[PDB]
Design an enzyme around this catalytic site. Structure first.
Site, PDB file in Angstrom:
ATOM      1  N   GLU B 189       0.869  -1.145   0.000  1.00 18.07           N
ATOM      2  CA  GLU B 189       0.000   0.000   0.000  1.00 18.07           C
ATOM      3  C   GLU B 189       0.909   1.198   0.000  1.00 18.07           C
ATOM      4  O   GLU B 189       1.315   1.665  -1.064  1.00 18.07           O
ATOM      5  CB  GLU B 189      -0.940   0.015   1.229  1.00 18.07           C
ATOM      6  CG  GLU B 189      -1.967  -1.135   1.204  1.00 18.07           C
ATOM      7  CD  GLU B 189      -2.855  -1.128   2.451  1.00 18.07           C
ATOM      8  OE1 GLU B 189      -2.715  -0.206   3.296  1.00 18.07           O
ATOM      9  OE2 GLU B 189      -3.694  -2.062   2.569  1.00 18.07           O
ATOM     10  N   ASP B 222       1.895   5.914  -2.734  1.00 16.74           N
ATOM     11  CA  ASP B 222       2.543   6.987  -2.005  1.00 16.74           C
ATOM     12  C   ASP B 222       3.521   6.446  -1.003  1.00 16.74           C
ATOM     13  O   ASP B 222       3.331   5.363  -0.457  1.00 16.74           O
ATOM     14  CB  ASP B 222       1.554   7.905  -1.243  1.00 16.74           C
ATOM     15  CG  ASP B 222       0.559   8.530  -2.220  1.00 16.74           C
ATOM     16  OD1 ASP B 222       1.012   9.245  -3.152  1.00 16.74           O
ATOM     17  OD2 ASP B 222      -0.668   8.300  -2.046  1.00 16.74           O
ATOM     18  N   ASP B 225       1.467   8.789   2.826  1.00 12.88           N
ATOM     19  CA  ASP B 225       0.072   9.060   2.614  1.00 12.88           C
ATOM     20  C   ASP B 225      -0.326   9.641   3.938  1.00 12.88           C
ATOM     21  O   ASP B 225      -0.382   8.930   4.939  1.00 12.88           O
ATOM     22  CB  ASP B 225      -0.749   7.785   2.292  1.00 12.88           C
ATOM     23  CG  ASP B 225      -2.222   8.120   2.048  1.00 12.88           C
ATOM     24  OD1 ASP B 225      -2.505   8.896   1.096  1.00 12.88           O
ATOM     25  OD2 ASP B 225      -3.079   7.609   2.816  1.00 12.88           O
TER      26      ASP B 225
END
EC number: 3.2.1.-
Lengths: 166, 331, 165
Positions: B189, B222, B225
């Site tokens: 992620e 990212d 984030d």
């Protein structure tokens, strides 16, 4: 240390007369509950000073000395938990009931001392660091100076060690 | 010695000042992993090339993520069923304890989840490899809002999810919690992530965390984030948060402390955040395949920004994009 | 287990490699603390508002400082004399020593100090709440001048004075 049993050699006598319980039974079971019930009743082990535990039948036999006996010899009986002791005579009447029996006594001390203590070897108990390295099974403690030369190898034998240098 | 198994090994009722040191976590089974990078440590953007590197290992790749299916199109169909839907992680969960600090965290397919905990740190983690469960996971969704949950020193590697993830952490006026002195590598992620909007029954939005001297190398998305109000709740009420009527979408007063952050190697966008009243300084994003920053912020100030050699594969249309009206002093 | 009390507890003349870990410092008396800020994390610049938030707590505030008297006018007069100028902080000291490293300091209304110390540091934290006394402080004011004295890692909150000096 400071720990001592009430009876230096366990002996059981009648409630209102000083005479040994002859042909009595002792039921050992869970604390603060009757050990008469088989569910509460727990198996008892003979604790060998060698470091062995063997299992014997749950009731203990009282001889004519008022002492515990199993296999026609004086035995040292232990349990895996805090236990209640109930003294019964030959007529099956309840002489005494003890709800709580707990002791810390580690005797044997071969099996016990592994689980209740930590091990760290001190460098002062060996003449060299090589001897204290191979004798370190967990901890290692450096409390004194060590000489060394160009190309001196110390082996720990692959053991995982927490080393503390003071 | 190790702790072998899968699922949660739950430790309960550990007092203040308790230490867990030298811990290793290894799964019994060996899960499938994919490597979406070359041998020069770039990226593989072809779906068939990532499938070609499919192997059972606990290193040199991380398990197929749901985010990887979106990132590389058609990869999911090519992948076999056994390599998908995996939950193979050896997780040491500290549940509702205070003062429990995990020192020297290592493992292969490892995770550490602190549930309902407060004032529990990850102190000097030494090269762990992550799994489906994050390496540093603060789950305060169960229990009250996390405070004092920090990452101080150490580094992480791999992971199929965020390496440092904050779920429902409010540092309050103290500004407790955050990530300081950290290096993250290949999160599925985002390397250091404050979760976007309301996720789960209760809010996962994060407020008042401190991010300084942190590095995220090669994130999928990212690196930082720092949003909390992205794609969730466009509707009138936002749970565990101010309404959308009170503050429009992509505006909240998170008030994170943002200085000295470095992002390199991002496949997608390297930096993104949302908020209002945010003050951002010293952001350097370079050598990224995708864009340097997509800033969804409005009424936020961005000072001393360096976007150099980003969007070099031209996934996006620009080196830096700002949707809102922001004040950028220096570029 | 906690180190409970107020004022310093000195450990003299320790040789090199001394370690202390997992220490918590709690004050046996709960002092009066002031809070010149809000729950929006914005200062109270009205002196009467600081006095209105006056409470006995061991966290969420810090004991009155002579510096707050200058910053907020008339705060000193409004505060009771038993609610200001007090030092109720559970404090520790190492005196004239080598090699003493203190790891993982915790507490509430806490402080640590060193005197005459060389090669001596504060490493890691549990995020302690500071009291009247400095959270990390070095003296050589008995002894002679330091060296090797540093601070690395950890962090602290609150304090009425500098948290490193």
């Amino acid at each position: 240390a400071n720990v001592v049993v009430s009876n230096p050699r366990p002996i059981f006598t009648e409630s209102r007369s000083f005479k040994a319980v002859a042909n009595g039974k002792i039921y050992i079971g869970q604390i603060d509950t009757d050990p008469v019930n088989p569910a509460n009743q727990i198996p008892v082990y003979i604790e060998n000073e060698d470091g062995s535990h063997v299992q014997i039948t749950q009731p203990l036999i009282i001889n004519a000395a008022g002492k515990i006996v199993y296999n026609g010899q004086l035995v040292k009986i232990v349990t895996v938990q805090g236990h209640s002791m109930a003294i019964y005579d030959a007529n099956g009447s309840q002489v005494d009931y003890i709800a709580n029996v707990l002791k810390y006594d580690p005797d044997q001390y071969s099996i016990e001392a592994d689980k209740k203590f930590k091990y760290s070897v001190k460098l002062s108990d060996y003449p060299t660091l090589q001897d204290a390295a191979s004798a370190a099974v967990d901890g290692l403690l450096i409390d004194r100076d060590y000489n060394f030369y160009g190309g001196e190898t110390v082996d720990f034998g692959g053991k995982v060690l927490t080393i503390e240098c003071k | 010695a190790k702790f072998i198994g899968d699922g949660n090994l739950i430790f309960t009722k550990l007092g203040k000042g308790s230490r867990i040191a030298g811990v290793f976590m290894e799964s019994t089974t060996t899960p499938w992993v994919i490597k979406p990078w070359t041998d020069d440590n770039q990226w593989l953007t072809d779906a068939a090339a990532v499938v070609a590197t499919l192997k059972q290992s606990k290193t040199d790749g991380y398990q197929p993520t749901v985010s990887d299916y979106v990132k590389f199109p058609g990869i999911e169909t090519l992948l076999p069923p056994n390599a998908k839907g995996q939950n193979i992680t050896s997780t040491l969960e500290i549940r509702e304890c205070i003062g429990v600090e995990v020192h020297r965290a290592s493992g292969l397919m490892a995770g550490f989840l602190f549930r309902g905990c407060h004032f529990c740190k990850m102190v000097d983690a030494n090269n762990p490899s992550g799994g489906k469960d994050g390496i540093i996971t603060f789950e305060n969704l169960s229990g009250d809002w996390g405070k004092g949950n920090y990452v101080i020193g150490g580094r992480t590697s791999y992971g199929s999810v965020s390496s440092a993830q904050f779920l429902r952490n409010n540092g309050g006026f103290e500004r407790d919690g955050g990530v300081i002195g950290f290096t993250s590598y290949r999160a599925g992620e985002s390397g250091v992530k404050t979760w976007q909007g309301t996720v789960g029954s209760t809010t996962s939005r994060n407020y008042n965390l401190q991010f300084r001297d942190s590095v995220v190398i090669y994130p999928v998305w990212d690196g930082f984030d720092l949003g909390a109000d992205t794609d969730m709740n466009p509707e009138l009420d936002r749970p565990g948060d101010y309404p959308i009527t009170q503050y429009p979408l992509h505006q909240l007063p998170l008030n994170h402390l943002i200085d000295n952050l470095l992002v390199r190697g991002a496949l997608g966008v390297g930096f993104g955040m949302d908020g209002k009243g945010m003050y951002v300084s010293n952001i350097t994003v370079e050598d990224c395949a995708g864009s340097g920053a997509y800033l969804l912020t409005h009424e936020s100030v961005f000072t001393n920004i360096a976007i150099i050699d980003t969007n070099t594969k031209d996934f996006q249309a620009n080196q830096i994009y700002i949707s809102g009206a922001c004040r950028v002093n220096g570029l």
